[PDB]
Amino acid sequence: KIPVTGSGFVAKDDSLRTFFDAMALQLKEPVIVSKMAARKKITGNFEFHDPNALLEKLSLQLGLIWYFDGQAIYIYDASEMRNAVVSLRNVSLNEFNNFLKRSGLYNKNYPLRGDNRKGTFYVSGPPVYVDMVVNAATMMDKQN
Amino acid sequence: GSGFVAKDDSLRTFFDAMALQLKEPVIVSKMAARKKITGNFEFHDPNALLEKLSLQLGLIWYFDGQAIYIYDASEMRNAVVSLRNVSLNEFNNFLKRSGLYNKNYPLRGDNRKGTFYVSGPPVYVDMVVNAATMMDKQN
Amino acid sequence: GSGFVAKDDSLRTFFDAMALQLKEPVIVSKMAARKKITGNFEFHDPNALLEKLSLQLGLIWYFDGQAIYIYDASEMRNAVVSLRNVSLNEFNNFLKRSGLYNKNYPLRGDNRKGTFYVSGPPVYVDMVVNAATMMDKQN
Amino acid sequence: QRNTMSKKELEVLSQKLRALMPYADSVNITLMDDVTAAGQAEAGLKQQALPYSRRNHKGGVTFVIQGALDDVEILRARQFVDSYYRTWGGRYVQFAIELKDDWLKGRSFQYGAEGYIKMSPGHWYFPSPL
Secondary structure in 3-state letters for chain C:
CCCEEEEEECCCCCCCCCCCCCCCCEEECCHHHCCCEEEEECCCCHHHHHHHHHHHCCEEEEECCCCEEEEEHHHCEEEEEECCCCCHHHHHHHHHHHCCCCCCCCCEECCCCCEEEEEECHHHHHHHHHHHHCCHHHC
**Quick one: how far is CA B135 from the chain centroid?**
23
Whether residue A85 contacts residue A113, with contact meaning beta carbons closer than 8 Å, is answered with no
- Residues contacting residue D88 through CB under 8 Å, at least 6 positions apart: D37, D40, D41
**Which of A119, A129, A110 lies closest to A85 in space, CA to CA?**
A119
For residue B37, what are the contacts with CB-CB under 8 A and spacing of at least 6?
B6, B9, B11, B14, B57
Please judge whether A4 and D124 are an interchain contact, meaning their C-beta atoms are less than 8 angstroms apart: yes
Distance CA B32, CA B9 (A): 12
Q: How far apart are CA B50 and CA B15, in angstroms?
A: 9
Count the alpha carbons within 13 Å of C63 in the hemisphere toward its beta carbon.
Answer: 13
Which residues share a beta bridge with B97? none
Interface A:C, Cβ pairs < 8 A: 69
Pairing of strands C68-72, C26-28: parallel
| Contact (CB, 8 A) for A114 and A124 | no
Separation between Cα atoms, residue D35 and residue D47, nearest integer Å: 18
Q: How far is A57 from chain B (nearest CA, A)?
A: 23
- For residues A93 and A117, what is the distance between their CA atoms, to the nearest angstrom? 6
What one-letter code names the amino acid at D24?
A: A
Determine the distance from the C-alpha atom of residue A58 to the mean position of all C-alpha atoms in its chain, rounded to a whole number: 13
* Gyration radius (Cα) of chain B, Å: 18
Say how far apart CA A87 and CA C137 lie, in whole Å. 10
Q: Are A94 and B100 in contact (CB under 8 A)?
A: no
Strand partners, C4: C41
Count of beta carbons in the 10 Å neighbourhood of residue D123: 8
Yes or no: say if C33 and C15 are a contact pair by the CB < 8 Å rule.
no
Long-range contacts of D121-126 (CB under 8 A, 24+ apart): D121/D53, D121/D55, D121/D64, D122/A3, D122/A4, D122/A5, D123/A3, D124/A3, D124/A4, D125/D66, D125/D100, D126/A10, D126/A45, D126/D102
Across the interface, do A24 and B56 touch by the CB < 8 Å criterion?
A: yes
DSSP conformational letter for B57: I
Element (H, E) at B26: strand B26-28
Measured between beta carbons, the chain A residues lying within 8 angstroms of C138 are: 87, 89, 119-120
Record: contact C131-A119, CB cut-off 8 A: no
Helix axes D71-84, D36-46, angle to 10 degrees: 160
DSSP-based three-state secondary structure for B5: strand
Which of A48, A71, A98 is the best substitution to test chain B (most B C-beta atoms within 10 A)? A71
Partners of C71 in the β-ladder: C60
Question: Residue type at C96?
Answer: K
Inform me whether the C-beta atom of residue A30 falls under 8 Å from chain B C-beta atoms. Answer: yes
User: Do residues B79 and B124 lie in contact, with contact meaning Cβ atoms separated by under 8 Å?
Assistant: no
| Beta strands, E only, A1-144 | 9-14, 31-33, 42-46, 64-68, 73-77, 82-87, 113-114, 120-125
Q: Is D33-102 in CATH node 3.30.70.1770?
A: yes
Is the distance from CB of A126 to CB of A76 less than 8 angstroms?
yes
Asked if A48 and D112 count as a contact pair (C-beta separation under 8 A), the reply is: yes
From CA D79, how far away is CA D100, in angstroms rounded?
A: 20
- Chains touching chain B at 3 or more Cβ pairs under 8 angstroms? A
How many other C-beta atoms are found inside a 10 Å radius of the C-beta of residue C55? 11
Contacts A–D by Cβ distance under 8 A = 43
Name the residue among A25, A72, A140 with its Cβ closest to that of B56: A25
Q: Tell me if chain B has a CB within 8 Å of the CB of A140.
A: yes
B76–chain A Cβ distance below 8 A for any pair: yes
- Please check whether residue A126 touches C, CB under 8 A: no
**How far is Cα C58 from Cα C54, in angstroms, rounded to an integer?**
5
Experimental method: cryo-EM
CB proximity A84 to B under 8 Å: no
CA distance B73 to chain A (A): 6
Residue type, C139: N
Q: Does C40 touch chain A (CB under 8 A)?
A: no
The order of strands in the sheet holding B115-120 is B77-82, B115-120, B108-109
Q: How far from A18 is each of A4, A8, A64, CA to CA, in Å?
A: 20, 14, 16
Closest CA to B15 of B69, B89, B80: B69
Cα three-residue angle A2-D128-A50, rounded to 5 degrees: 60
What is the rounded distance in angstroms from the CA atom of residue A42 to the CA atom of residue D10?
65
Of all helices (H) and strands (E), which one includes residue D65? strand D60-65
Helix, coil or strand: residue A128:
helix
Comparing C-alpha atoms, which of D118, C18, B35, C133 is closest to residue A60? C18
DSSP letter assigned to residue A94: H
- In one letter, which amino acid is A141? D
CB of A70 within 8 Å of a chain D CB? The answer is no
Cβ atoms of B81 and B132 within 8 Å: the answer is yes
Cβ proximity of A117 and A88 under 8 Å: no
Mutate to test the interface with A, among C11, C27, C71 (most CBs of A within 10 A): C27
Fill in the amino acid letter for A69: D
**Is B105 at the interface with chain A, CB within 8 A?**
yes
